[PDB]
Design a protein around this nucleic acid. Sequence first.
RNA 1: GGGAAAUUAGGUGCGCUUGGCGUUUUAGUACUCUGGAAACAGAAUCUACUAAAACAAGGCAAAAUGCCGUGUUUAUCUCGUCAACUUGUUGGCGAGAU
DNA 2: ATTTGAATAGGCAAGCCAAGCGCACCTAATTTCCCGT
DNA 3: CTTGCCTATTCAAAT
Length: 847
Amino acid sequence: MKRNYILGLDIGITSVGYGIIDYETRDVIDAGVRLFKEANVENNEGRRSKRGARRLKRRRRHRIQRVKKLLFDYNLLTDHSELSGINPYEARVKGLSQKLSEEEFSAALLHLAKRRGVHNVNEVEEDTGNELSTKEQISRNSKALEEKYVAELQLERLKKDGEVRGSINRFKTSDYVKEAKQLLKVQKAYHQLDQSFIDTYIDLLETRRTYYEGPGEGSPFGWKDIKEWYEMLMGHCTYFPEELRSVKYAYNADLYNALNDLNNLVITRDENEKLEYYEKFQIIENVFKQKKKPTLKQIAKEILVNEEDIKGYRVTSTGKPEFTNLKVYHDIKDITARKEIIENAELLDQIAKILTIYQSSEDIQEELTNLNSELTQEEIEQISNLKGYTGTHNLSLKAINLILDELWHTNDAQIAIFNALLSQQKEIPTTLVDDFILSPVVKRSFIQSIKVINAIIKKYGLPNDIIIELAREINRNLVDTRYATRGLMNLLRSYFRVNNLDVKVKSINGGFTSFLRRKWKFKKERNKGYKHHAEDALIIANADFIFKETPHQIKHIKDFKDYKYSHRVDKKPNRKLINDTLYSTRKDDKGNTRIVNNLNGLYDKDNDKLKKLINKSPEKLLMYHHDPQTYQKLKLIMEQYGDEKNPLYKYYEETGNYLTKYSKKDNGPVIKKIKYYGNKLNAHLDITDDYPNSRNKVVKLSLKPYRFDVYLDNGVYKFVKVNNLDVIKKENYYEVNSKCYEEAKKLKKISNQAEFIASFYRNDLIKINGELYRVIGVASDLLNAIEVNMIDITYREYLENMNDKRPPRIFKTISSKTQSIKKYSTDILGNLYEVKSKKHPQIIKKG
RNA sequence: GGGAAAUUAGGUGCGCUUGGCGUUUUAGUACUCUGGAAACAGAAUCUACUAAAACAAGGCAAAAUGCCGUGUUUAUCUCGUCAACUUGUUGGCGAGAU
DNA sequence: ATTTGAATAGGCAAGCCAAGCGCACCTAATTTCCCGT
DNA sequence: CTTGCCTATTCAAAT
Ligand SMILES: [Mg+2]
């Protein structure tokens, strides 16, 4: 409306506060908070890490299947071949001397390809008894294999230590290939197999993709070839967008940086203080092309002037004068000093590019040979083994080759030479943040902040001033100096400037607000609720009044009530579906399926889990039923060393021997985990068909919710949970599964004559028996409970300020007792609306 | 006061390539029980090792260093319009209401 | 008068860590340059 | 740290 105002903003990690104030009177108009989930780097790190893991497991499986096909082709494996009881460590060690059977031979080759070592680990030759260090383990093993093969060492441990697998099982692929070559050398005699077989098999075994190949064809994450790969990555020029930067060590790029140094030099001479063309020419030719690292003495001699006269040079942290080093010139000169080659800039830029862009020597050699030069194959092979070619210059070659003559002649700054030689928008576009790169956290707070400003400009018209305060991860250091804060205000100032809108964007320092709170006696406390973020914003906005022209104004701020909250609602499909862990099940005495649990860490000083379990519930142990003799043997220990936390710890401490299974001759194995009956099985995902002939049931737990759809059925409120498992990707859209959905309604006994009321997503707003909350989820589908939270404060904090000691969670049962359920919604500003729903639930979701 | 480049040292993010593990099932062997002079047969499925297989539910693809599946964006409803495939819904744009 | 069912309180558990690579951007120190308060 | 979901405990209503 007509009235003119200021807009405060308190940008935060989870929140954007906003405050709006009359420009004349400084009375509060409005104020509110927009709350969101902190954008944690952990989240995407998770997504990426798991995508990596899925490819590793896919590639192992596909390598095993490529081996099998080769064994089918050379008629060593069939559909009806018994590989079942063939110890491959025996077969590996046997087949390095004697004839294997086709089955033993197939067993062995398949065992090698499954598990084939590292390829990128060099010796450290150090041992500080670190179990988890790959480098230290790889080295300890390298020593063990001086005289023997991996399978020899592996069979030795199987027999001495009783086991092979684990942390000590870390070997180099080259150690495995040495074995395979020997195995195939012996076996070639007795089996019909040829050099094609042997070459093929070792390729399968040793080969893997490189970091600069990346995925195969289909991938959204892939790329066609190395240049595409590098082009995608590298940055763009400042003065000529749509041109990729130069590589750091191109001849013209280093020569550019060389000239700027010399142009900066100031000398106390009778003639001109700055260097002349001829002087610069002879300095470059005699110093920068002769000496690898120019020194001030060597420059001083060429001029024929004392060192102290020359001033205005780059200085190392130590104190030495620093001058640019021509990398490529020297690198190639050192290989071959032919004037045809090393006095040709265009070639020396090409060689540099190739050396930066290509990664392996054998790729560089081809790319140089295709370059069609006067270089010899001997020279090319030396070039291809050069190091340290990375990175980019800030300018493109286009930009450098433009101004190289001006730097040669005039003693000018680069900026001076380049100096010499949004309007269609209605609202602030949110893509502009994406242009410049930020912390994932901050990028989210900012996208929200622009969406919040847009919504105010719409509702109230343009502000006179906008003011900003970011959260920190009488004095005049108020203008905030952080890359993000600068970035934001540059975005905004640009926008208003272009579209010709008189708006004064500003900022103030994080600390400053706190000072005014102390000054005007206004205690900050998260205790109260989310309102603190908003009443930060209103303070910021009143600092604007102080930076133009008090009890009464701050009385308005402090006594103000009509705050507004806008929690963001997540509707994204295909989030995490379920928890990773797998659980076995068992039917107990009463005929109840139960999850099986495990007690690990039995021999730890402060672990009372088993002692608690034995005293409470001895019948929950599976060995209570199944190994009674070992049970009685364990009970005598618990009675012996009752007084301590962990009776078994004393058993290990005093005698120096882990607890073994009962046996007549004292040769039962150690006990290291104990299985016992845990919770009853209700809500689960059944994965038992992945395990053919599993006796019991194999399950996963924590079905994670997508939404719940409320229905009103003959005066009774009811609801369905829709799981994320119930939602399925099609071509360009997700679909809620119809069969799962009608099944779900049937377990809930929801009639065909029942009216759909609403769908509730996470953070959707719900009014239950006249009380408004935000939705968290479905506590129990079966019992018909939904977890909610409060709006203005977390229920945890509501109980703390009360000093109440209940559980800090709200659960609400939806039942015949429930009288009304209504859905509400807020705009981004927190204006609240009772909202209408469609006639049916949503099935398609294009976003 | 703001912006820019170079050098050295560290950090952050996106992406890629690997390795040993871990969870779980089936089998074998050891441990237990029963029978047998013994080999061994059966019972038990508990404790341990080894192999093979699965590991967000799934979806493609078809001999292939094969590919995707946990991130980001995300108040609601109506009308107009363009589009989409699911053929009456849900996306973009615009307008309105809540 | 005792037993059965609802509601509230109480509590448990959730995959991991080591090796390598590209590019981008930030900070700090030092020197120089270009615009202006 | 939060959330999905089970167990156990306490009080009121029905046989
Ligand atoms: Mg705040």
